[PDB]
């Protein structure tokens, strides 16, 4: 991730800067304490040492204040480079003048070590370059110390110090990269999440008015949103139910492109939405040739009739400007009635907040008998119309009828590696201490080999724990580990790992069981041992911080204060002070590192949280879309802006509850108990669509007792084992199905049985989507209004199937009783067929 690993450092500068600075602080105190030794007791016979230390001090403080410089951005890698080169020079220069017998070589060694761990941590050197220059410094240091096996010992000291430092580098920078990538993912998750939220909100307000949508967006009732994974209805009265149905409708819909026609339609509909929003008139929808609105139902309005009729005149202006614009001989009849309407939301598929009354049906009948240019109004309209407009008693030419016309890197991963490393290095520790015996083929002390093997097996058992945990080999028994990990918790793991990391102290002490203080070679050698030992405790940064630190502290401390009284006098003082320094050093280092680990944990949590949140949000939005849109069109707009297509043969069935409005009887608060029961049976019909064979059944929409279905539409590819016109058969299957369903629901309908009439047709039709920044998608064609009047002229318990639909369904196993010949507007007296073969009388 080249430019991305670049961005890492782009943001990951300040931590490196501050760590560098505190390391500088360390170095300063280091040369400080060297000087205070060499000035207090010994080496006061030559002051050529304090001057190098002090010029080191001054160049380090120059680093200190220069770090803040503006020209420090890309000016840091080679900075670390030159600085550590400097430090190396100081070390070896102080180192050479030795091998006289007055002072320990390990002091220089100790420096070399802590130096190189600093070089490790903050310098952020190239993996290979870091390693190689480090090991180079190591080897040149051990060589220049030369002025049969002790040298090999010091060498292994180098090697272990390498291994620890190098792993520390690798884990630190993988921590960096991982945390960087993770926080990036988190913020991108936040952003595309709120994007998803905005999108689903667009979908909400496109399927719910601002009043009710904004009501549900504070989730007053959480059961609504639980269903989204709870309906309130209001008998809002004194509202203006307004309709407008296209005249010249079937005409203008004769020979268009079947797509651009929809386009100009949607254009006019944007005009009409403008009219709604300007007149504060709450539009409802469009049923084929007929657009419709109410006027301020949720926000109750009194001049609702006024803005109603003024928006009507506005739409009149719109249609005139368009028909004179697109050169069309088209208009639309208009019809409005006012009064009471109970409004609410039922249904779980393609459903909506809608409205119900006979005032609705009154405006409906008046509109179908209405004329373009003069809205057909009733008395309830004219009663507070106040006739400030072009009132006209427009009588029906065939009921108070009027007209108006104007005016990687996991937690175990880490423990895996660090355990492995602790093990191997404690083993090379063991090699080192052992090889004290070079000629003594027999080892006198038994504790050495004893606890050697002991710690060895402890390491190997922790090893196999880790390796069969990760690799999942499961030789003996796996449920064992399952019950076993339950005991390894945040603190138990703490103490066990504490033992594991603390052991090398007693490991080297097994050799301390032997007499040493006589042999100062042995003495200083053991000092080298114990310091090279304490170096490691910075390792398991997944473990304790405060307790880990204190542990390393006391374990380094104790035995040396013991040797203080076990006696080569003031060299104890100097070594204990250097231990003090390196103590506070590693203290704050692994402090920083465990802190980085803490923040990694933290950010990990919240990032996965955001992932889950946007997952849920996206999924809920998609669920809502599937409520509101089909799939093929989801693909169409997923790739385009719109879609429309003349589908020349599909079925269409309409179902209307005959005895609804009477057992609707309004003794109650609108009888909305009955409306609860209606949402019950509606959800039952949704279950009906929830059938797999009823996946290809396109339930279009509904208006209270209305129900609209059509198929042969998403049937875009017909396979050989499928007939292109079978969908009518499964549609009629669904018809008899829902008949059975209402029959069963009636048995549970308390002291009542609801009945419905149904009318069917099939043939020509055309799909097209409307809403952009809105959402409306509908089908049209003569088939629509044909089945409309069919169900309109129907009778319950009998299935009025049109002539040609009767024919095409009879050959598919359905037996129809010839109802008769009924007038169809646009078709005149049309031959009709009920399905049930005298299930009723006949």
Numbering used by the authors: 97 to 197, 217 to 262, 278 to 359, 384 to 552, 566 to 574, 780 to 939, 976 to 1250
Article sentences:
Adenylyl cyclase 9 (AC9) is a membrane-bound enzyme that converts ATP into cAMP. The enzyme is weakly activated by forskolin, fully activated by the G protein Gαs subunit and is autoinhibited by the AC9 C-terminus. Each membrane AC contains two conserved cytosolic catalytic domains and twelve predicted transmembrane (TM) helices, with cytosolic N- and C-termini of varied lengths and regulatory roles. Here, we present the cryo-EM structures of AC9 in several distinct states: (i) AC9 bound to a nucleotide inhibitor MANT-GTP, (ii) bound to an artificial activator (DARPin C4) and MANT-GTP, (iii) bound to DARPin C4 and a nucleotide analogue ATPαS, (iv) bound to Gαs and MANT-GTP.
To characterize the conformation of AC9 in the absence of G protein α subunit, we determined the structure of bovine AC9 in complex with MANT-GTP (an inhibitor we used to stabilize AC9), referred to as AC9–M throughout the text below, using cryo-EM and single-particle analysis at 4.9 Å resolution. Our choice of MANT-GTP as a ligand for the active site of AC9 was based on two considerations: (i) we have used it successfully in our previous studies of membrane ACs, (ii) the overall conformation of the AC catalytic domains stabilized by MANT-GTP is similar to that stabilized by ATP analogs, such as ATPαS, based on X-ray crystallographic studies. Due to the low molecular weight and innate flexibility and pseudo-two-fold symmetry of the full-length AC9, the resolution of the AC9–M reconstruction could not be improved beyond 4.9 Å. Although the cryo-EM maps of AC9–M and AC9–C4–M featured the density elements corresponding to a bound MANT-GTP molecule, the location of the nucleotide density in each of the maps was distinct from that observed in the previously determined AC91250–Gαs structure in the presence of MANT-GTP and forskolin (AC91250–Gαs–MF). The nucleotide density stretched out towards the forskolin binding site, suggesting that the molecule may have been captured in a previously undescribed orientation within the active site. The local resolution of this region in both density maps (AC9–M and AC9–C4–M) was not sufficiently high to unambiguously define the pose of MANT-GTP. Based on the available structures, the G protein-free state (nucleotide-bound state, corresponding to AC9–M) can transition to a partially active state upon Gαs binding (Gαs-bound state); subsequent binding of forskolin (Fsk) fully activates AC9 (Gαs/Fsk-bound state).
